[PDB]
Design a protein around this nucleic acid. Structure first.
Length: 175
RNA sequence: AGAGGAAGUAGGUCUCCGUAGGUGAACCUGCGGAG
């Protein structure tokens, strides 16, 4: 018997108030957004540490901000990973004009560039200021990470998109 | 002004918060902020 309790920030309170994991993978659940905690208890129906860690990874993904569609995709696919990249990681300058300028470069107007990168390398990323969150198979996450760090190092977005497209094709290929 | 003669050139997304207005619980818009 094992338990795991995860915190949520108060961003996602309503969507966590929206409703099932006990039916998904037989792991009993308690929640309280006043203490900001989610408790996952292992009853007798529970079998695997893999399933318990999977429920933990799912609830942490929904806390860190993905929607329920890609969240249950993370629940069902065992070959799907998440990664958290802070924007203060490896950095070209000591100037604190980083934040607005670089995340404007990454997003683009009406999310066009984030959307094009997502549809290109098949990942799903979310963006909240400092922290960016990438979701996908780990090699595609590597592709999106290299694209984003090139964007924050300051290459032109058209050039980055072109190079990303040809690398996306050559990795999609088998032989 | 005249018919001939001769010549040459051809780049802030998402969430949340505080606002002000809108049709009010909610919801939308705009702005200011934190992730």
């Amino acid at each position: 018997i094992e338990t795991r309790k995860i915190p949520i920030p108060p961003h996602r309170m309503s969507a966590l108030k929206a409703n099932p994991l006990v039916d998904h993978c037989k792991l009993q659940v308690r929640m309280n957004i006043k203490e900001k905690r989610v408790e996952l208890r292992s009853s007798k129906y529970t079998v695997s540490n893999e399933a318990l860690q999977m429920g933990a990874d799912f609830v942490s993904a929904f806390a860190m901000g993905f929607d329920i569609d890609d969240a249950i995709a993370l629940l069902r696919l065992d070959s799907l990973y998440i990664q958290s990249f802070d924007i203060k990681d490896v950095r070209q300058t000591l100037g604190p004009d980083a934040l607005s300028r670089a995340i404007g470069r990454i997003a683009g107007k009406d999310g066009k560039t984030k959307f094009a990168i997502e549809n290109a390398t098949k990942t799903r990323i979310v963006l909240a200021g400092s922290k960016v969150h990438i979701l996908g198979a780990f090699e595609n996450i590597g592709m999106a990470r290299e694209s984003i760090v090139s964007l924050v190092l300051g290459a032109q977005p058209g050039k980055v998109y072109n190079n990303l497209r040809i690398i996306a094709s050559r990795m999609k290929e088998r032989w």
